[PDB]
Design a protein around this ligand. Structure first.
Ligand SMILES: [Mg+2]
Ligand SMILES: [Mg+2]
Ligand SMILES: [Mg+2]
Ligand SMILES: [Mg+2]
Ligand SMILES: [Mg+2]
Ligand SMILES: [Mg+2]
Ligand SMILES: [Mg+2]
Ligand SMILES: [Mg+2]
Ligand SMILES: [Mg+2]
Ligand SMILES: [Mg+2]
Ligand SMILES: [Mg+2]
Ligand SMILES: [Mg+2]
Ligand SMILES: [Mg+2]
Ligand SMILES: [Mg+2]
Ligand SMILES: [Mg+2]
Ligand SMILES: [Mg+2]
Ligand SMILES: [Mg+2]
Ligand SMILES: [Mg+2]
Ligand SMILES: [Mg+2]
Ligand SMILES: [Mg+2]
Ligand SMILES: [Mg+2]
Ligand SMILES: [Mg+2]
Ligand SMILES: [Mg+2]
Ligand SMILES: [Mg+2]
Ligand SMILES: [Mg+2]
Ligand SMILES: [Mg+2]
Ligand SMILES: [Mg+2]
Ligand SMILES: [Mg+2]
Ligand SMILES: [Mg+2]
Ligand SMILES: [Mg+2]
Ligand SMILES: [Mg+2]
Ligand SMILES: [Mg+2]
Ligand SMILES: [Mg+2]
Ligand SMILES: [Mg+2]
Ligand SMILES: [Mg+2]
Ligand SMILES: [Mg+2]
Ligand SMILES: [Mg+2]
Ligand SMILES: [Mg+2]
Ligand SMILES: [Mg+2]
Ligand SMILES: [Mg+2]
Ligand SMILES: [Mg+2]
Ligand SMILES: [Mg+2]
Ligand SMILES: [Mg+2]
Ligand SMILES: [Mg+2]
Ligand SMILES: [Mg+2]
Ligand SMILES: [Mg+2]
Lengths: 260, 188, 155, 124
RNA sequence: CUCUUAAGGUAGCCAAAUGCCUCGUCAUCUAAUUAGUGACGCGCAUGAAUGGAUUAACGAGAUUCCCACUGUCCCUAUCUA
RNA sequence: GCCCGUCGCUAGUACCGAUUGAAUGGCUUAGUGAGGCCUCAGGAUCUGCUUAGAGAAGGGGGCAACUCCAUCUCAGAGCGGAGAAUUUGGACAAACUUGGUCAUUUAGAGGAACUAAAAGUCGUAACAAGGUUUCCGUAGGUGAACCUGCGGAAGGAUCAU
RNA sequence: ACCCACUCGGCACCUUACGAGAAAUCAAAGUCUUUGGGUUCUGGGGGGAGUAUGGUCGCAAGGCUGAAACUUAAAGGAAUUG
RNA sequence: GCGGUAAUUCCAGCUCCAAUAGCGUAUAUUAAAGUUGUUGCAGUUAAAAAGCUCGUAGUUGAACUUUGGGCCCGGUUGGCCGGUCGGAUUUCCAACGGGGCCUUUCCUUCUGGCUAACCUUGAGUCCUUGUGGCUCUUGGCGAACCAGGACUUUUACUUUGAAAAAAUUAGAGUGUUCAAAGCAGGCGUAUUGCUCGAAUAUAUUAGCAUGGAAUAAUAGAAUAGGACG
RNA sequence: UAUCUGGUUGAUCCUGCCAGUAGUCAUAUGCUUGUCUCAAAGAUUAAGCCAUGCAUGUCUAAGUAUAAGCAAUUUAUACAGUGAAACUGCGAAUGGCUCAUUAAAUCAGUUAUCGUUUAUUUGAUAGUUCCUUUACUACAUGGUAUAACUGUGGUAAUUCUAGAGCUAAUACAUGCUUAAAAUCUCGACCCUUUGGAAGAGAUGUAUUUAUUAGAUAAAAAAUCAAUGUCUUCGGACUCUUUGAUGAUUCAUAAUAACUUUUCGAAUCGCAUGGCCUUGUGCUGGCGAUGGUUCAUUCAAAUUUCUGCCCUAUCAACUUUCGAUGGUAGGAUAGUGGCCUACCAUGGUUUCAACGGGUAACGGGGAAUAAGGGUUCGAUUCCGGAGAGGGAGCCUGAGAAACGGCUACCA
């Protein structure tokens, strides 16, 4: 329709944002950025609808315009800026550090992290090609380019990132039996270690998953993000550790914790 | 303007299709360069998303590669001789791709009689060396040799002058030359 | 379809950027290029042995096969280097909880590395638009004749 | 451009409009519990109508079905929690039985009357 | 019902090249129509090889309208033999 | 008792119908064809690079000879740019004139139906062996229902020699 | 040629009614709310009307195809008693 | 269907009924309608079997091809005890499913990469008189899937799953004073915070991924131009 | 949440419809109307016509200030604050409204781009620019020509503008530069061998063409043409380098050149510091705007499979004037009969083509509660289409835009 679309209507915004139906019409439209529009948390939704730190959005621009907030170490004044999976949100004032990571309901959770863990991040390499002048490069789900990676680093492997500087310190090959975080589908937010991979030339490989409850499931490879080894992750998981109890199981936990 | 859509143009069953919306600008098309020979004249064309396209009208010189000699030179394009699509392009000396032309050949003779010290048709120390390390090389070819006598070489335009503004090609050799030669005289 | 001449057209038919130097004497004449399309389709020997050009061939040509892979039965071999196949299927009509025989006809380019006869089941695979209609290219012949030499004379 | 403000209605209306038995039966409910409308009876029997429906639907699923368990126990505990469903009959073939007055007996209209405090449901 | 006949005009058709009255009445075409056409019919006096009705095709036949065309006209002028 | 048709009255509906009838909308032949766009020309003017003159400047470093860079100023000369009005030829193509086609409506003297409708006039066709058993197909005929010829049917008034 | 018994395959009658049906009746008109062997065709209140219209076939008479506006509370079937 | 002189239908008065901040009329549509009939109609006489046969498309179409037997493995309810400080698991037990074996039994197939599994056994033993029990390397499982080569009769059905917008709908939690709603809210040290949420389901026809091999199609070897090597 | 009742007859049982009955996020209309919450609303008919007002503008320390503007104070004799006007930039292609056209179109679910364009965001990304190469080319930084403005004016009239005089830039138009190294063709000389050499030029990126590398399906030899490195001078060459995909002529690189040569900072704000051979020398802090190619992101454009209402009183349809396919080209951002040329005779259909109707935008969905269904969706979300009707086009990353222009019709 004649060009780029600059608005977002409520009910059109993604549901893992948890925006209320009423109280206006529109939603914040995530800016162009590191993360896809439909998977992302604009700074306003974070600094307001989650952290309850600012009541307006008019207030939320007052916070960012003092450069309290910094994403992955750079400052970031953009209200709708598309923050996303694995990004580190730091408030200079209030000494606070976050990493954006998934619920088992598929929602971004407020997750507080240590000051020292806040200086690195996990990229998933989406592609690795041979660039200009023979320099091979790697690019990560968040749209970083790292020139001169290790030759052994292939697509679907994940990557540890210096933040402060850009460079890749370590990588984790995509391997049968490695700690996996589902980003996509209804299994979004579950954490399952990789049983085995269905091939399917022509498209859509499938990655079989078994979490630490010995429950199993399947997703498309595109939705599989390697975080580490069974047991030891390379990041601090959110509470619940991506297991996914049934409605029954969850009705009991919430009604067993009662006595005041 | 011109429109490259499929919305006109009956469906495969032959059914007549109604007109749905209007002409969009992104299905547009423009008129042929119909590029001619001599006296370089080029107009750029502002295309989708910035992106100049250079529409050549009237080109004299081009850059032509002897492929078996692995060298490229710039010569006068003399004229159009054969065209597969339409003959009026030949008769008008219009330059398009796949057009068969004739070119100067003196830039190619000067290279050959220097590089090979042999010449065609019919003393320095280092040069004497080089010219010996060559031939058993220099046998050229008949149908390519007799063309230097006339001083004009058959080459097929490999570029798109109404697109790039360049008129470029490669000297005819091998089977290609044998082909288009038969076409010439058994049509001529 | 094709069938002989190889060189009959107003333009010289060749493969792009496949050069044979006339200086270097060769016992094969022209050098010929090909590939495997993928997905397991054997690139048939008549493509590598052949002299035909066909830039729409999935093996010796400049088209890639990607997207749908379908099978239908050959209903028409008439137009040059292309055929029409019928694909039947039953369509479920819920109110009556029953099906009806339907069909579509898919125009598809066929390289003259296959000899296609009408009645042949043929495996076909998708394409960039080749023409106004043809979106598919013939990648395997799963049929043969269906008792052609069993059509012969008496005792 | 807004969210639709949604809604639904609370009452159903009787099929056969003039039935001496049903009009006798209904007025007696308004007489006992202090109602101003036949709609206040219509409203309740509509609530009951769907509860029976949900209970009818669950009762057809297998016993110890995940859905039947989650939604069946939840319907029950809510009917207990207000006081319509008796603590013994807690397994929902009674919610399938029930009746209108069990809901009417639970109205703050009536409970202000039930222990003193009112004396004549109209004064309530 | 009455007189009365050899029988008392049937199927058709119509102000028709057949209708006095008559420039019939209605409709249509026109600015306007004693014109034309379509209807109407107690039809002075229509009508069945005195042939009735219909009818493609044909007509230097009679008649009405339209398009084109025009010095027929408005309104006349000039040229050649 | 029931009951059928012509004939007569009021009212309504749709049909046929001279007008080679009318109106709206969608395509569309032929002819004419605005406009921007592409293109051959054009040069209202206003500059460019080059070549030479005359009058002054600044020194590459000398005692006379010798000599580069940038800048302004008027007789005079070669080889490219800008670029208005204008204009050649195009593709695109609105629109006008005259036709045709499809769809949807619609006026009309008159004609001919049907209904409301029960009834009025004329007869008695059907219902009783309905007073000539009834009905079917066909064909001719008569104010009207109907009559009559040739074949059927029983739904007959005969399950029977 | 006849008689007697059996068996196919016919044209029918007789008695039954498990069964079916609004009944009259029906070895199918049965095995149908305990509703599904396979398949073709036609009907959807009465009148308008087998009319109009278009197409099509015919020498013609006419045949096949075949509406609507409007009207209307019945029309109709079998059986009962008069 | 009432009204032509005592009108239970009109015009009023009285009284009464139903629904009630709403109630009536008109139009449409849905249920009633098994009067559109797949579920599920009807056609001798009520509407309805084409005068008759042939016949293409279409729909439909007899029966038969691994059935039966033996062993192993481990699951999920439920019984009788409960050992225990409402829930626990072993032995006893039936029941119902799943996997894999061997019975003449391709499992696509080589060429190794791999092994988790016992025909192994190398020692013997925790311990109930011992096949109750697993750690444990030196001759001895292929398929559990890597990846390369070489090839593969086509389907319908059904299972599970992925890919999947929100609002709607179904539905859980929460006392908006009730409710339609909303997605809130609930706790203290109410002087400097603590804390659960913001589920779940449907989402089919098509495409994709996985299991099943009944039912129903399809192809195969007869001028052998067969199958193996 | 699986119900029926009144009407054919003297009475009966049927067939069958009419009537009743109930609901409607379904409109109207009548009578009636006190409170809380919620709040649809010129869709239907006329995508008919429109008075007037409003609905798109926009500035940071950080592109341009001699306002003859305001403030003056506070160091600022080039400027420095604030700041109209105007330039320059970006935006006006989002939003909002409507549902006319539209029936294999749209739309939906599912695909494809190994068939493309993409402002912005986000990550990366540039020592090469001159020239016969000692009497050098502004790099301590090259050129004018304009608004606003000043003044003279024209017209009944408009967001009309003319002649005249100035002056800016991140506007316009120009134009220098930087290490080392290696590889290539040339080659003055010298000397015969098996042969080697000073020093001359070329080599950024982009553009266009031709050529080459981009291996790999398990192992070995000989000969021809060239021509590499190492001599223990017959001869040997040993270690030998390899990216991604199911798939590529892929990514990337090599050679000969080609170009009215793309880009490679003549920009702006803050701070002002080191360092000696004391030149105001040579350095140097934080970040702004830019800039080429690649990536990411917002997108776009096409695109695979399957699915639309009524209609045979529509059975044949498609190729005038592309209909179906082949070759070549042109055009496109790019695939493609998109278009042209040449060639062929193809493509669809009773499994309903083609045609007609639609009081037809499609979808998420709505109404009706045994189930099966029937009916509806202009309309709060998604997609598409439009701006009185048609067509055309400038600007631009993006529009065939209409609160843009041009033309025709009304
Ligand atoms: Mg935004
Ligand atoms: Mg052909
Ligand atoms: Mg007359
Ligand atoms: Mg006359
Ligand atoms: Mg007279
Ligand atoms: Mg006249
Ligand atoms: Mg007349
Ligand atoms: Mg007369
Ligand atoms: Mg006479
Ligand atoms: Mg005659
Ligand atoms: Mg006459
Ligand atoms: Mg006329
Ligand atoms: Mg012109
Ligand atoms: Mg009689
Ligand atoms: Mg009689
Ligand atoms: Mg008679
Ligand atoms: Mg009868
Ligand atoms: Mg009285
Ligand atoms: Mg009264
Ligand atoms: Mg069924
Ligand atoms: Mg019926
Ligand atoms: Mg009958
Ligand atoms: Mg069978
Ligand atoms: Mg395998
Ligand atoms: Mg009656
Ligand atoms: Mg009656
Ligand atoms: Mg009666
Ligand atoms: Mg009704
Ligand atoms: Mg509206
Ligand atoms: Mg409107
Ligand atoms: Mg100032
Ligand atoms: Mg300033
Ligand atoms: Mg919009
Ligand atoms: Mg100038
Ligand atoms: Mg026919
Ligand atoms: Mg072509
Ligand atoms: Mg419409
Ligand atoms: Mg609709
Ligand atoms: Mg809609
Ligand atoms: Mg619809
Ligand atoms: Mg409408
Ligand atoms: Mg309007
Ligand atoms: Mg028009
Ligand atoms: Mg427009
Ligand atoms: Mg407007
Ligand atoms: Mg607009």
């Amino acid at each position: 329709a004649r060009g780029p679309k600059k608005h977002l209507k409520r009910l059109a915004a993604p549901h893992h944002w948890l925006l209320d139906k009423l109280s206006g019409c529109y939603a914040p439209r995530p800016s162009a950025g590191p993360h896809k529009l439909r998977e992302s948390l604009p700074l306003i939704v974070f600094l307001r609808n989650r952290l309850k730190y600012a009541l307006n959005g008019r207030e939320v621009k007052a916070i960012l315009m003092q450069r309290h907030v910094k994403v992955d170490g750079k400052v970031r004044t953009d209200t709708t800026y598309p923050a996303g999976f694995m990004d580190v949100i730091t408030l200079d004032a209030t000494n606070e550090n976050f990493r954006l990571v998934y619920d088992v309901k598929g929602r971004f959770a407020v997750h507080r992290i240590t000051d020292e863990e806040a200086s690195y991040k996990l990229g998933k390499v989406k592609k690795v090609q041979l660039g200009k002048k023979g320099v091979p490069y790697v690019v990560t789900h968040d749209g970083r380019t790292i020139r001169y990676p290790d030759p052994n680093i292939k697509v679907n492997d994940t990557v540890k990132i210096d933040l402060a500087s850009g460079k890749i310190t370590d990588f984790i090959k995509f391997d049968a039996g490695k700690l996996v975080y589902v980003t996509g589908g209804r299994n979004l937010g579950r954490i399952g270690t990789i049983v085995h991979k269905e091939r399917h030339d022509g498209g859509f490989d499938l990655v079989h998953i078994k979490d630490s409850l010995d429950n199993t499931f399947v997703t498309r490879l595109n939705n599989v993000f390697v975080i580490g080894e069974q047991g030891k992750p390379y990041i601090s998981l959110p509470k619940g550790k991506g297991i996914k109890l049934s409605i029954a199981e969850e009705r009991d936990r919430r009604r067993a914790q009662q006595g005041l | 303007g011109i429109s490259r859509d499929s919305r006109h143009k009956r469906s495969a069953t032959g059914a007549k299709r109604a007109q749905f919306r209007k002409k969009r600008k992104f299905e547009l098309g423009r008129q042929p360069a119909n590029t001619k020979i001599g006296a370089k004249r080029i107009h750029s064309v502002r295309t989708r998303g910035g992106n100049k396209k250079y529409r050549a009208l009237r080109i004299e010189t081009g850059n032509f590669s002897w492929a078996s000699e692995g060298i490229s030179k710039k010569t006068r394009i003399a004229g159009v001789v054969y065209h597969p699509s339409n003959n009026e392009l030949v008769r008008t000396n219009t330059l398009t791709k796949a057009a068969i032309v004739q070119i100067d050949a003196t830039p190619f003779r000067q290279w050959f009689e220097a590089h090979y010290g042999q010449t065609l048709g019919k003393k320095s120390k280092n040069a004497e060396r080089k010219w010996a390390a060559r031939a058993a090389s220099a046998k050229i070819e008949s149908s390519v040799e007799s063309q230097f006598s006339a001083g004009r070489l058959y080459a097929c335009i490999s570029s798109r002058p109404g697109q790039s503004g360049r008129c470029d090609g490669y000297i005819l050799e091998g089977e290609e030359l044998a082909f288009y030669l038969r076409r010439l005289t058994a049509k001529k | 379809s094709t069938e002989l001449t190889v060189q009959s057209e107003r333009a010289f038919q060749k493969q792009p950027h496949i050069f044979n130097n006339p200086k270097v004497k060769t016992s094969k004449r022209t050098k010929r290029w090909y590939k495997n399309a993928g997905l397991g389709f054997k690139t048939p020997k008549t493509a590598i042995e052949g002299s035909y050009i066909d830039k729409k061939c999935p093996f010796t040509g400049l088209v890639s096969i990607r997207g749908k892979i379908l099978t239908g039965t050959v209903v028409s071999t008439k137009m040059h280097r292309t055929i029409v196949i019928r694909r039947a299927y039953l369509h479920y009509i819920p109110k009556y909880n029953r099906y009806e025989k339907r069909h579509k006809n898919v125009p598809v380019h066929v390289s003259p590395a296959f000899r296609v006869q009408v009645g042949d089941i043929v495996t076909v695979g998708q394409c960039r638009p080749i023409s106004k209609t043809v979106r598919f290219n013939v990648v395997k012949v799963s049929a043969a004749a269906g008792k052609a030499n069993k059509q012969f004379a008496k005792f | 451009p807004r969210a639709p403000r949604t809604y639904s209605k609370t009452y159903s209306t009787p099929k056969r409009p003039y039935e001496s038995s049903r009009l006798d039966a209904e007025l007696k409910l308004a007489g006992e519990f202090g109602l101003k409308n036949k709609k206040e009876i219509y409203r309740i029997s509509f609530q009951l109508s769907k509860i029976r429906r949900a209970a009818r639907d669950l009762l057809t699923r297998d016993e110890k079905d995940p859905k039947r368990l989650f939604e069946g126990n939840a319907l029950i505990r809510r009917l207990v929690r207000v006081g319509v469903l008796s603590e013994d009959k807690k397994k929902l073939d009674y919610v399938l039985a029930l009746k209108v007055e069990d809901f009417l007996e639970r109205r703050l209209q009536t409970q202000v009357y039930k222990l003193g405090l009112a004396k004549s449901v109209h004064h309530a």
